[PDB]
Scaffold this active site. Structure first.
Site, short mmCIF file in Angstrom:
data_model
loop_
_atom_site.label_atom_id
_atom_site.label_comp_id
_atom_site.label_asym_id
_atom_site.label_seq_id
_atom_site.Cartn_x
_atom_site.Cartn_y
_atom_site.Cartn_z
N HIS A 148 -2.30 -0.28 -10.55
CA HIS A 148 -3.29 0.75 -10.28
C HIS A 148 -4.43 0.65 -11.29
O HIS A 148 -4.22 0.25 -12.45
CB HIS A 148 -2.67 2.13 -10.34
CG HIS A 148 -1.86 2.47 -9.14
ND1 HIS A 148 -0.78 1.72 -8.73
CD2 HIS A 148 -1.96 3.50 -8.26
CE1 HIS A 148 -0.25 2.27 -7.65
NE2 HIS A 148 -0.95 3.35 -7.35
N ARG B 23 2.80 -2.65 1.28
CA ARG B 23 2.31 -1.33 1.66
C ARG B 23 1.08 -1.37 2.56
O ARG B 23 0.13 -2.11 2.29
CB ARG B 23 1.97 -0.52 0.41
CG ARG B 23 2.80 0.74 0.27
CD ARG B 23 1.94 1.98 0.10
NE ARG B 23 0.86 1.77 -0.86
CZ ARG B 23 0.11 2.74 -1.37
NH1 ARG B 23 0.34 4.00 -1.03
NH2 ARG B 23 -0.87 2.45 -2.22
N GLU C 149 3.50 11.70 1.58
CA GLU C 149 2.65 12.06 0.46
C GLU C 149 1.81 13.34 0.59
O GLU C 149 1.45 13.96 -0.41
CB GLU C 149 1.74 10.87 0.14
CG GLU C 149 0.97 11.02 -1.16
CD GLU C 149 0.78 9.68 -1.85
OE1 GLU C 149 0.33 8.73 -1.16
OE2 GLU C 149 1.09 9.61 -3.07
N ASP D 249 -1.39 11.78 -4.51
CA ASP D 249 -2.14 12.48 -3.46
C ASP D 249 -1.46 13.80 -3.09
O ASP D 249 -2.11 14.75 -2.65
CB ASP D 249 -2.27 11.60 -2.20
CG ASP D 249 -3.54 10.75 -2.19
OD1 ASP D 249 -3.65 9.88 -1.30
OD2 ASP D 249 -4.44 10.97 -3.04
N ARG E 103 -9.62 8.88 -4.11
CA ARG E 103 -8.22 8.63 -4.38
C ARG E 103 -7.71 9.53 -5.51
O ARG E 103 -8.49 10.28 -6.10
CB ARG E 103 -8.01 7.17 -4.74
CG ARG E 103 -6.92 6.50 -3.93
CD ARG E 103 -7.17 6.70 -2.44
NE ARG E 103 -6.20 5.97 -1.63
CZ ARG E 103 -6.05 4.65 -1.68
NH1 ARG E 103 -6.79 3.92 -2.51
NH2 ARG E 103 -5.15 4.05 -0.90
#
Lengths: 904, 904
Positions: B126, B405, B515, B552, B714
């Site tokens: 990330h 993903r 999420e 999230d 994000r």
């Protein structure tokens, strides 16, 4: 004295677990009985111990023998560690301060001297190493575990694990067979001595220098030592020396010299690969900026996906990473180039695609340094960068330079066949003045002599082969070309010819090997005669080098005579050079044991005539010693320390030159010594009979230490034989009479000897070494072998020698002024005391084993098995000797040599 | 506070020793000044700094910015040492004792449970790593030199040479542009996170395990932990996670999964090679004797000239070396195989020529271990041979498994288009009930679907292609297929199909990623539904995984709400599973900051519903955290320690289940916390402008952190935003209301709130985390950005949040019964006091810098260059913002990021 009981206790337990108390008790007893012998000194113990061992069954015998061997080894291991801890809790910083302070020398003088100094240490594979790489490995592991085990910050669990570690390595070592079953190969040997380079010396050198820097600044000199200067260099004989050893064919050299180049290439990559990560600066030289940009547009490729780090193209935003990267890529082809060359016949990889010379590798590096220092960041340059730079100058592109050796009579064969064929006489039957004529005409000529139709010979070719390969490989990957047993100057020229005649770019320099007594005498002779050849003297260019051997010198004459002879020889030779203005440097063929010219490094340098080093010296590290000197970290750091500190001082503060008085007595004594020596080993007929009887000289070849496929022969076994029997005959044989003579001549001479021993380095060191030998001897033990092996008739002859031993030792202690041997070194005796009892066991063991092997009708009473019950015996397929006898013997030699710290 | 100064002190000394005594002073002043505010509060002084700072020459503005950056950085370094050195004076052994002693568990019960435990730590890349990879190298270097420089057995020279290095290294990082110019690439990102594996975790795993072996002994079990049992396992997302990131083409996937195998195979060689030198016994299994007999009997007697060790044929007297050597070769091929598949297109090296499956690789290794055991050398086998076995069962041939993903909808895009193109209408519009019906029948069919002529978007391809790459690559190199934004059972069934319809041997297991609050609540249903479809249940094979996001999740709904919801989520999910007897394991998408579900490992695992973990658990390590959790070796060991311990307890010593009263009140405060929440972020158009007005959100990209390019934002950028401005709005927003409310709805609730913060682990940790948050936020800096960048219009709106903030913090301390913040942690506070004054200065230098961009007509009185001078600023060629602003802005962020010890 602590680790001793530790390593031993540990072992004893493992022993018990694997084989059961019964056996652990036996080994336990042997020690006791030997103790009473070494303690009360009652000879009945040796005989009792003999009864204990001759009963043992094959498997137990092999086990018992092996057990003492391992315990002994451990002892030595413990000692090293103890020495390291102590002395940290000699030194350049010392010798500098001392030289500048005491001796008073301008720090500039030192600095300069240091800059102009170079100690080249050449490793050689003389069959002096007993342990096999397998055990030598477990050792380095145990050493290391033992150290971390004394860490004063390790938790409880931490320690607990480290211990478990130490034990399994002990057990693992105990579980491997220590009897090398096959002879090693020349390639295998090179792979051995190499292990030290890329495991301790590689990353050592740079650290050593860092300290030499810290030292310099501590003396005022606020300047590090220039990275171009090389204080120490390493050379090798593994693959180059082919004298008397047919297995080192001309291909063996290509292979070893190619493989070594690949290793260097490989090492440097890890260096650069990371260095790139460090030099992430952007502020660069106006000069580097250019160099960098050019490589940016030139590359244009970035698809290198198989690269773990720095795969895509590097932006010119990071100047150094750019040049470094380039250097790295070229480095990969150098590694791979060699791989292919080694694997197949050739490589797709081009010559220009790889580094072929040191300058080609320095230009980029050096650039970064300047750039850094210029754009400010010097310190950042003096970091990893400075280290790598030094490595390149010390190790170059092939880890170590390779020397070459071959007795000249072979060069005579070649040259003779060339003349015979061409129809111009037999070079052999030519007088020295004739040969020098022809050879000199040729060197001056321009027309080729080597006929393509020349009738080859396995050897006549084997030699041409060698030269060709010298042409193939780079010029840098080689050292000098030594000529064994080469006398007249024609012998040095015959090689100068073949080199060029077999086409050699930069023909390597020729250096003679003076070893036999005779040759050492007439050494300054041939030397001068050689500087008298205009052609030679002209191509030599001032620099000249000659090798002086320490082994055979005292083999044919006494140790005393030889020791003095080598002194005189290199003493004069240094003038025959100084007179013709040539910088002659000496190559010292020093062995491991004092008998072959060995001994402490600083002492050995100090014992050399003043003004004969001047910052230029080559010294051999015979097999076994390589382990001793660079086995561990600290060990290696000491060897480097020691060498440079001694060589530096021997120059700026030379030893005293012998007074006329001494010289005369010395020369006189030397004669008596040699007359005394040759009298018994040569003049006495039945000597050799007695020799091959009271010693295991014969069984020496069984250990398989080297790859070399009788009275007038070999020296390593010679020294070895008496070191096993703990007599040391060769090391002192002369000295007895040499002393009594100088006294029986004039009483006042005794006072001279005492004068010498106190003021003349050569002489003190010479005696001081003989004391250490005596400290490791024991006429008692010598007698046992006699009694058991030596025949009745010559039994008394032994006793005579036994007496000369004692006599010589008294005389020795008086001159020195010692009421007790090694009265000076208390710890050196402490060690011995712990060791001796184990060695004495292996002695008695060996003694009776030989007795059984030789006298098949020597009845014995067999005892019941001890170990928990062999394939241990089936390990030696076909043996000429009955069951365990062979392996057992090889083991005893293995261990006795271990406890003694010396093979031969 | 020791090195805390040592480090800083030398920095300055270098700073002034490079740019002039003025800059050193200026930097000094700015702290001197800012130190007053932090120790006073009068924002008045603050304005001063702002003036000066903006009035600095572009070059100086950089220097002054970097200095405070590199300084602040150091602080984090000296703090990492201050912890080790002081801790070296949480623990599995402890936890194992506490479990058998205090918890009253059977040591066999603990051992057994330990054999069935597993903790999959998933590294991801990330855009949280706001640190230059080139800078990290130098930090490690420093840490190492800091630790060593503080030993006790080092000498003066040793100390001087070390301190000397420690500086040239600090000067190295400074002389290096800390701002990455070119954005990273997916390959470059997998490389960053991979380094930690071979640089630490590779050696670390066996160590951590032996220690566990030690612990198991220190409590009873005298048996080691079976090598096939893996307590921890490593997985990556770097290259497999393509959600929201286009740049991760399906090629990048094969690319990294190939390179990884080349590294894995590579590492194994260095190991096996070594282990060949160790295992040198001659004793062995009848089984191994036979095996090794064959290998020696065949594979010729070939020699490999380019092999450093064991070049020639190995004798069968070394059984272990024979087998192992064969494994080494098989290994060299495997390493070369992939090397080729990467660089070129294919390889000559055969399939059988190398290792394909772990079984092929294990079979031999295991043969040895058992042979050594049988023959008595178990202690030898448990040495290096065990460590390797432990590595094989933990790293396999790939080193780390890869998760894939992709957003749920992106799968609809494809299915919807393959129906539109075929006969039947549109998937997308179909009701969920429909989708399941169709998909299910289709999955039970025998006739193809995916049409050749099917058109393809630049999107419908990126997804269908990816499915093909999975078909090629080996099954062992893949983790699960995670469907981001999972919502309904069809979402899963769609990948179940697409997968088989694209041809796949072992269809990766598909796992939902609930999420959004909405999906979280519904999750338990979905999960149950999927367990209802006979087809699925059969292909499930009893196991099932489901990830749950934190990032999230806390985005749509307040922190408190999300936090609570997640609890219930896994709470019910488990029950569902349990009902159908499914080994459900949960994948935890924990972030780096508290805002993305961050916090102390143990605390976290603690704050999870009892009986949900037990067997297994997966957890993410967001970029930045990788450096943290695995930067040093001591860090790694401890991280492994933490997880396995925490995880073991939660199973045998589960936390308390909330009381009905607590449950109810939670549910309530839940809705109240979202209400107050969305009401300020969703139900408010005036908000969106304040965001881009007060926080430097639109500047996040200027750091080129990762490759990934209102609710359109994000998680990371979200928190990053309010974290820089020291307000952390997203982490405490809802909370304030949830409390106040329950305080009014009834008074007996205040006693119930406290009553909860004492006994309920979950409720405690949550508040405790908050306290740290507030322990870092300072409204002073919050409003400072208002009077500087917030529109005069909604200026008050800002001060309105200010009051909610302070109101919330206040109430929190009340529930916790604390006087101050971090009241119960003197160390931390002591750290903020020394670190903050620096962060502030950077905030000041950031608030004004944003204005010099937002308001061109901002007059700022220049000053004279403090440093000794252009090219510095010209490091950024194409920049929209004026001279030193572009760089200084990015810098000010990077710097504050380090100060807060968090980014996203």
């Amino acid at each position: 004295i602590e680790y001793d009981a530790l390593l031993v206790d540990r072992f004893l337990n493992i022993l018990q677990d694997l084989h059961g108390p019964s056996l652990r008790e036996f080994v336990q007893e042997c020690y006791e009985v030997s103790a009473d012998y070494e303690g009360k000194g009652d000879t009945t113990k040796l005989g009792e111990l003999g009864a204990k061992l001759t009963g043992l069954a094959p498997a137990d015998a092999i086990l018992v023998a092996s057990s003492i061997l391992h315990m002994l080894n451990l002892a030595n291991l413990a000692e090293e560690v103890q020495i390291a801890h102590r002395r940290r809790n000699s030194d350049i910083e010392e010798t500098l301060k001392r030289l500048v302070s005491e001796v008073g020398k301008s720090p500039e003088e030192v600095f300069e001297a240091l800059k102009n100094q170079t100690v080249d240490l050449v490793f050689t594979a003389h069959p002096t190493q007993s342990a096999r790489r397998s055990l030598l490995q477990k050792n380095a592991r145990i050493r290391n575990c033992l150290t971390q085990l004394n860490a004063k910050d390790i938790t409880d669990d931490d320690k607990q694990e480290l211990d478990e570690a130490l034990q399994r390595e002990i057990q693992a070592a105990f579980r491997t067979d220590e009897i090398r079953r096959a002879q090693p190969t020349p390639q295998a040997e090179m792979r051995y001595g190499m292990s030290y380079i890329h495991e301790t010396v590689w990353k050592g050198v740079p650290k050593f220098l860092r300290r030499v820097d810290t030292a310099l600044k501590n003396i005022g000199i606020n300047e590090r030592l220039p990275y171009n200067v090389s204080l120490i260099r390493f050379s090798s004989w593994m693959g180059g020396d082919r004298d008397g050893n047919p297995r080192v064919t001309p291909e063996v050299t290509r292979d070893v010299c190619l493989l070594a180049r690949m290793m260097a290439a490989n090492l440097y990559i890890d260096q650069i690969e990371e260095l790139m990560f460090e030099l992430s600066m952007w502020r660069c030289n106006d000069e580097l900026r250019v160099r960098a940009e050019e490589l940016h547009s030139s590359s244009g490729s970035k698809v290198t996906k198989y690269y773990i780090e720095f795969w895509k193209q590097i932006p010119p935003n990071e100047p150094y990473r750019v040049i470094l990267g380039h250097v790295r890529d070229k480095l990969y082809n150098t590694r791979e180039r060699a791989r292919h060359l080694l694997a197949s016949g050739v490589s797709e990889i081009s010559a220009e695609s790889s580094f072929t010379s040191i300058e080609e590798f320095l230009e980029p590096l050096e650039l970064c340094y300047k750039s850094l220092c210029d754009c400010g960041d010097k310190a950042i340059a003096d970091g990893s960068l400075l280290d790598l730079l030094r490595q390149v100058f010390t190790f170059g592109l092939s880890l170590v330079k390779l020397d070459i050796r071959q007795e000249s009579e072979r060069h005579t064969d070649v040259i003779d066949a060339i003349t015979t064929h061409l129809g111009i006489g037999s070079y052999r039957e030519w007088p020295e003045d004739k040969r020098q004529e022809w050879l000199l005409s040729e060197l001056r000529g321009k027309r080729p002599l080597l006929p393509p139709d020349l009738p080859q010979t396995d050897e006549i070719a084997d030699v041409i082969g060698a030269f060709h390969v010298l042409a193939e490989l780079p010029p840098d990957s080689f050292g000098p070309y030594i000529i064994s047993m080469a006398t007249a100057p024609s012998d040095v020229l015959a090689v100068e010819l073949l080199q060029r005649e077999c086409g050699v770019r930069q023909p390597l320099p020729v250096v003679p090997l003076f070893e036999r007594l005779a040759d050492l005498q007439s050494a300054p002779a041939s030397v001068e005669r050689l500087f008298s050849v205009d052609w030679y003297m002209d191509r030599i260019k001032g620099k000249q080098q000659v090798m002086v051997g320490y082994s055979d010198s005292g083999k044919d004459a006494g140790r005393l005579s030889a020791a003095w002879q080598l002194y005189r020889a290199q003493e004069e030779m240094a003038q025959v050079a100084k007179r013709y203005g040539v910088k002659l440097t000496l190559f010292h063929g020093r062995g491991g044991t004092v008998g072959r010219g060995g001994g402490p490094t600083h002492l050995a340098i100090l014992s050399q005539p003043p003004d004969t080093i001047n910052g230029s010296i080559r010294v051999t590290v015979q097999g076994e010693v390589i382990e001793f000197c660079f086995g561990e970290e600290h060990l290696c750091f000491q060897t480097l320390q020691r060498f440079t500190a001694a060589t530096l001082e021997h120059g700026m503060h030379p030893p005293v030159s012998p007074k006329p008085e001494w010289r005369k007595l010395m020369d006189e004594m030397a004669v008596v010594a040699t007359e005394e020596y040759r009298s018994v080993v040569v003049k006495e007929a039945r000597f050799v009979e007695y020799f091959r009887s009271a010693t295991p000289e014969t069984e020496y070849g069984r250990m398989n230490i080297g790859s070399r496929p009788i009275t007038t022969l070999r020296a390593i076994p010679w020294i070895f034989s008496w070191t096993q029997t703990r007599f040391h005959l060769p090391v002192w044989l002369g000295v007895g009479a040499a002393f009594k003579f100088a006294i029986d001549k004039d009483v006042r001479n005794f006072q001279v000897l005492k004068e010498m021993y106190n003021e003349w380095p050569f002489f003190r060191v010479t005696l001081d070494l003989l004391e250490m030998v005596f400290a490791k001897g024991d006429p008692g033990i010598a007698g046992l072998y006699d009694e058991l092996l030596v025949a009745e008739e010559l039994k008394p002859f032994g006793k005579q020698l036994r007496d000369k031993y004692v006599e010589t030792q008294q005389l020795l202690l008086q001159i020195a002024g010692h009421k007790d041997i090694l009265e000076g070194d208390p710890f050196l005796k402490q060690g011995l005391v712990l060791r001796n009892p184990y060695i004495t066991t292996l002695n008695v063991f060996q003694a009776y084993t030989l007795k059984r092997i030789r006298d098949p009708n020597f009845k014995v009473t067999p005892q019941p098995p001890l170990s928990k019950e062999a394939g241990l015996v089936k390990l030696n397929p076909a043996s000429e000797y009955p069951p365990g006898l062979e392996d057992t013997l090889i083991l005893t030699m293995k261990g006795i040599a271990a406890g003694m710290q010396n093979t031969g």
